Design a binder for this molecule. Structure first.
Ligand SMILES: [Mg+2]
Ligand SMILES: [Mg+2]
Ligand SMILES: [Mg+2]
Ligand SMILES: [Mg+2]
Ligand SMILES: [Mg+2]
Ligand SMILES: [Mg+2]
Ligand SMILES: [Mg+2]
Ligand SMILES: [Mg+2]
Ligand SMILES: [Mg+2]
Ligand SMILES: [Mg+2]
Ligand SMILES: [Mg+2]
Ligand SMILES: [Mg+2]
Ligand SMILES: [Mg+2]
Ligand SMILES: [Mg+2]
Lengths: 97, 140, 41, 79, 159, 120, 95, 55, 101
RNA sequence: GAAAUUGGGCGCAAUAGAUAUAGUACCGCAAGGGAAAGAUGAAAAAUACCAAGCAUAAUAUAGCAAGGACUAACCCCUAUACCUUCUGAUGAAUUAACUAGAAAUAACUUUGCAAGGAGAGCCAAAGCUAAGACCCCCGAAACCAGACGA
RNA sequence: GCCUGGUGAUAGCUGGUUGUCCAAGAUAGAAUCUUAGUUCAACUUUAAAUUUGCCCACAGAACCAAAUCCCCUU
RNA sequence: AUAACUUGACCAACGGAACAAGUUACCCUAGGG
């Protein structure tokens, strides 16, 4: 019977955390800081998807050409096979054409 | 598992509260209880038609029996009560047959009197006076 | 404008009141249930 | 093999009688075909101009400020 | 694992009143992980289900099955704790109210899986003479039942 | 092949015997028909289904008024096996705006323009 | 066609399509007639006049050719002395 | 960019275009954005008309 | 429908009558009236000056939930609906009769 | 398919996440394949109620096992199991958990701005920008490369 | 041979595709190493613009049966 | 092929693959009757 018998511990959430209180600040650093930075230069993450959005085949292609030279061996290998699979899927399979 | 289903005891129990009175494993095993419960609900809605039908044949059995006690048959009673503008229905006639058998006897007398006036009227054909109970009340 | 004058009488705009312009968001159709998926289109 | 009862013959016959009287009442029109011509052309034209007019008057509804602001009431509280 | 039957000897009732019948004693005892199957214990457990404990002991001393000796140890043990621990004055004055057998935690032996079967044995003894067996119902009981069913019937689907 | 059936004109020519049978006069005929669907369009060709939809006889046992003109009579001749036709007779006049609400079409075929619910 | 290339992740044009057809900016594809330069010795001059024509394409042929090329080919082109330039904008349609 | 009462503007546009059509033009005000959307091209007539009105 | 009715009893009607609970009602359309030794039956209704049947509204309930399921095999055709009709209960107070023959 | 040129977590939380408590146990001559599982409490120097399956409690004329009912469980009446494949045989003992629709060219809807739109590149004879909204799971015999095997 | 890899091989073939409720919805064909499949059409669906559609009366449609086409009125 | 105009298949399996035969009771797999 996959249901729990006692109700779980309560989820104490601090809405006035440092992160929550200061979320969203400097999203308008462009439009009211004389366009010296874009907001996309505010985001932190992988180097191949800072200010870039793609589907999965494009994320894999971009990751391979941007960081693929210093990827580990079997990660590089898995990623080559994922591009090869996702190529054969987006280009040859589906409903609409 | 990002989001797997937590609230599944209650989906099962929505089905199985309807099966608690079956036999065998249909009362407990969702896979069996679903087929039987669906099938029970389909019977439950098609049985509304048969409830109405079977009440009516039950009433015709009771009116038939009670009118055979007075020598009439069922077509004679119903026909010749329509012809008196007594538009009682089968439910009421069956209930009068059981609970008020003098009213039912007098209705059988009114229907057999009308039946004989039908005979005598459709025997002596031509312009004649109509029967007394044969007269109709015109509504305008 | 009469419309800001409407905004006086209403509770404050918060992150709990917000709503997209009706017509913006078409709902996602996904293959679950009797209609959207058995052969799934 | 299926055979024909008295019910079936009497039923068939009363349908034939209704049919024969339909034949009778269709045997005496009130007008000739020359007389009826265009006697209802105006009402037919107006009727179709109404169909045509409801077809060509199709457009999105008006959008109001009061509806959009009235969504703010979902956090109306007591004091 | 649950162990609710051992705890049942720990219910304490509030003391009675002088204008109130004497409550009979109730002695819940069991044994766990008997190496025997639960459906062979069902016959031995079923055999003794309303007997006095002397009749139960006597019937289990002459039974050839393996479980009979185990149940006899459980009943002698429960007769002891009946008198020592639970204030039953007469050893003789008990009867078996409940005698069941559940399955125990079985083992699995790979040969090809084969289960090493275990079982439990649950007995409630109740202080008092064993209740008289139910008499077979007579033709008077059948006739009264039938006539009462005839008196019971209604005019159906009417007023 | 099953096709659409023409019916000859001798079928729609009354005889004085028929004027004795039904209640008709060849001189001064009736203006309005009452048409009622008494048979289903199922198991009938699609053209008869259409004519039933045009005449406004989708529901059975519901009377509909038509004109006794040769166009409407042509459509009625196509589906004359599904319908029933009687002349709309009018004992009193056609209803004025005073008697517009208080009418009732009786079973006889007449349309009475004063419909009380009292006995005579 | 290729919906996502392996290098760019872009759509690709089918170059057969470009090699045979002409996209006018209004959406009409112009083509040449099949067999306009074959077996001219056995064709009547009416038929040869019919084959030497620039023939528009169907609606579904047009949408099939739109899907097989990319947005580069759908673009305004202000050439110098273009022969087809008066046929780009569509005059005087009443839908 | 209609700022103010869009319903007066819908009444006045509807009174302006109906001789050029016979019928009242079928419109849609969008009171939120402050637009007014008429069916059929009347761009030159409304630009000239709004120059007459002084906007 | 035709209800056979005495005084002091109950009728359950399958629609909301849009009356307040407690309101008295004269039921017209009585078409048989019987006593022990005589009956009176109308063609088809009795005179309003002859018989008077009164009834109060007691309660205005809904029905028990009432299932409507459809199912066709091999077609993936399974609908389910649950319906509760409104109902009012009438208490027939009196059948008064009058000497108008 | 170029180039010139340009310039910590809206993660998982013991069938999940790593195969991993371990490359262990086990299987294989070997290369190699490859598991499962734990839950007290502050202190152990303090020993409930819920799956299927059963038991308490075997059975009573008759029949997809119910439904209409009914004073009444049965008796009366009505009722050719579900999925899938065909115009109209397949698979499933049962329970729990796991297990299958991924793409925004064009069109549409909703905003912004508008002869211009876009935070360069691009489009524009009302357009352009932004968003929303469309494209599944399992299953061969094979072929090739490199090892391990008499 | 067997193992690992390519490898989520490929499969026009088999099997399977998980909440609710409502709505609209079934039978011309042409090509194809094609007839276990696809493409176009036909039919189907939504949205949009407009103006006729359907039923049909005279007249009318060839020499060597039932009907149909056409078609104003209605 | 031809400077060009043009010309080029019994591509006859005739909407035409630029050029590929017999056989398997050793057949094999996926399916259908
Ligand atoms: Mg019936
Ligand atoms: Mg693992
Ligand atoms: Mg259980
Ligand atoms: Mg039976
Ligand atoms: Mg299914
Ligand atoms: Mg060796
Ligand atoms: Mg596959
Ligand atoms: Mg294939
Ligand atoms: Mg429908
Ligand atoms: Mg070929
Ligand atoms: Mg195929
Ligand atoms: Mg015409
Ligand atoms: Mg061929
Ligand atoms: Mg061919």
């Amino acid at each position: 019977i996959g249901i729990r018998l006692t109700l779980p511990p309560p989820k104490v959430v601090d809405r006035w955390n440092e992160k929550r209180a200061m979320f969203g600040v400097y999203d308008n650093i462009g439009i009211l800081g004389n366009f010296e930075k874009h907001p996309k230069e505010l985001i932190r993450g992988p180097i191949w998807l800072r200010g870039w959005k793609g589907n999965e085949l494009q994320r894999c292609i971009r990751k391979r050409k941007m960081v693929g030279s210093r990827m580990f061996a079997d990660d590089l290998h898995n990623l080559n096979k994922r591009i090869r699979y996702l190529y054969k899927h987006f280009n040859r399979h589906g409903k609409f054409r | 598992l990002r989001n797997r289903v937590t609230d599944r005891y209650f989906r099962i129990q929505e089905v199985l509260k309807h099966a608690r009175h079956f036999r065998g494993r249909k009362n407990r095993c969702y896979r069996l209880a679903v087929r039987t419960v669906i099938r029970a609900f389909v019977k439950c809605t098609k049985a509304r038609y048969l409830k109405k039908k079977n009440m009516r044949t039950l009433w015709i059995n009771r009116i038939t029996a009670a009118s055979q006690e007075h020598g009439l048959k069922y077509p004679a009673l119903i026909g010749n009560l329509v012809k008196c503008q007594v538009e009682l229905n089968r439910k009421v006639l069956a209930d009068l047959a059981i609970y008020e058998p003098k009213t039912f006897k007098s209705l059988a007398a009114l229907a057999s009197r009308r039946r004989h006036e039908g005979f005598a009227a459709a025997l002596g054909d031509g312009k004649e006076p109509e029967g007394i109970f044969s007269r109709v009340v015109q509504y305008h | 404008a009469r419309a800001l004058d409407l905004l006086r009488g209403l509770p404050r705009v918060s992150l709990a009141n917000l709503k997209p312009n009706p017509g913006s968001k078409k709902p996602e159709r996904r293959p679950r249930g009797r209609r959207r998926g058995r052969k799934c289109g | 093999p299926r055979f024909v009862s008295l019910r079936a013959k009497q039923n068939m016959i009363r349908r034939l009688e209704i049919e024969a009287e339909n034949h009778y009442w269709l045997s005496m029109p009130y007008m000739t075909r020359e007389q009826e011509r265009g006697h209802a052309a105006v009402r037919r034209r107006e009727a179709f101009e109404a169909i045509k007019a409801a077809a060509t008057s199709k457009f999105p509804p008006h959008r109001f400020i009061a509806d959009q602001l009235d969504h703010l009431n979902v956090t109306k509280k007591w004091s | 694992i649950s162990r609710k039957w051992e705890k049942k000897n720990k219910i304490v009732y509030p003391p009675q009143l002088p204008g109130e019948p004497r409550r009979p004693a109730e002695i819940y005892h069991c044994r766990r992980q008997i190496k025997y199957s639960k459906d062979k214990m069902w016959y031995l457990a079923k055999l003794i289900r309303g007997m006095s404990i002397d009749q139960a002991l006597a019937q289990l001393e002459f039974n050839d099955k393996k479980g009979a000796k185990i149940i006899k140890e459980v009943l002698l043990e429960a007769q002891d704790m009946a008198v020592r621990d639970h204030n039953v004055e007469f050893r003789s004055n008990l009867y078996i109210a409940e005698s069941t057998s559940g399955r125990g935690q079985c083992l699995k032996r790979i040969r090809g899986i084969m289960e090493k079967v275990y079982c439990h044995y649950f007995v409630k003894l109740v202080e008092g003479p064993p209740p008289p067996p139910e008499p077979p119902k007579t033709a008077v009981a059948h006739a009264k039942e039938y006539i009462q069913q005839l008196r019971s019937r209604t005019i159906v689907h009417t007023l | 092949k099953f096709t659409r059936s023409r019916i000859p004109e001798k079928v729609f020519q009354a005889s004085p015997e028929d004027h004795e049978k039904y209640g008709g006069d060849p001189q001064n005929p009736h203006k309005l028909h009452i048409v009622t669907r008494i048979k289903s369009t199922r198991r009938r060709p699609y053209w008869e289904k259409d004519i039933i939809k045009m005449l406004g006889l989708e529901k059975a046992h519901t009377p509909q008024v038509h004109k006794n003109i040769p166009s409407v009579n042509a459509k009625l001749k196509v589906v004359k096996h599904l319908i029933r036709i009687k002349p709309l007779k009018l004992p009193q006049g056609l209803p004025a705006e005073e008697n517009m609400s208080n009418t009732c079409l009786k079973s006889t075929g007449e349309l009475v323009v004063q419909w009380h619910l009292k006995p005579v | 066609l290729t919906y996502f290339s392996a290098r760019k992740g872009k759509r690709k044009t089918v170059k057969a399509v470009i090699d045979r057809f002409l996209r006018l900016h209004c959406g009409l594809w112009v083509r040449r007639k099949a067999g306009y330069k074959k077996k001219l010795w056995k064709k009547t001059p009416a038929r040869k006049k019919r084959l030497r024509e620039f023939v528009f394409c169907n609606k579904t042929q047009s949408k099939l050719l739109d899907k097989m090329t990319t947005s580069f080919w759908k673009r305004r082109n202000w050439y110098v002395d273009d022969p087809y330039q008066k046929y780009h904008d569509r005059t005087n349609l009443k839908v | 960019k209609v700022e103010g009462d869009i319903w007066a503007l819908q009444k006045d546009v509807e009174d302006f275009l109906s001789p050029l059509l016979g019928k009242t033009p079928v419109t849609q005000v969008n009171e939120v954005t402050g637009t007014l959307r008429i069916k059929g091209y009347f761009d030159q007539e409304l630009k000239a008309w709004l120059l007459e009105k002084g906007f | 429908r035709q209800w056979k009715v005495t005084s002091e009893d109950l009728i359950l009607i399958g629609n909301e009558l849009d009356l307040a609970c407690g309101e008295r009602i004269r039921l017209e359309k009585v078409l048989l009236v019987g006593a022990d030794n005589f009956t009176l039956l109308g063609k088809p209704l009795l005179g309003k000056d002859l018989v008077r049947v009164e009834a109060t509204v007691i309660e205005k309930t809904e029905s028990w939930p009432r299932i409507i399921m459809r199912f066709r095999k091999r077609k993936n055709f399974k609908k389910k609906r649950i319906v509760t009709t409104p109902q009012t209960v009438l208490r027939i107070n009196s059948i008064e009769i009058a000497p108008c023959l």
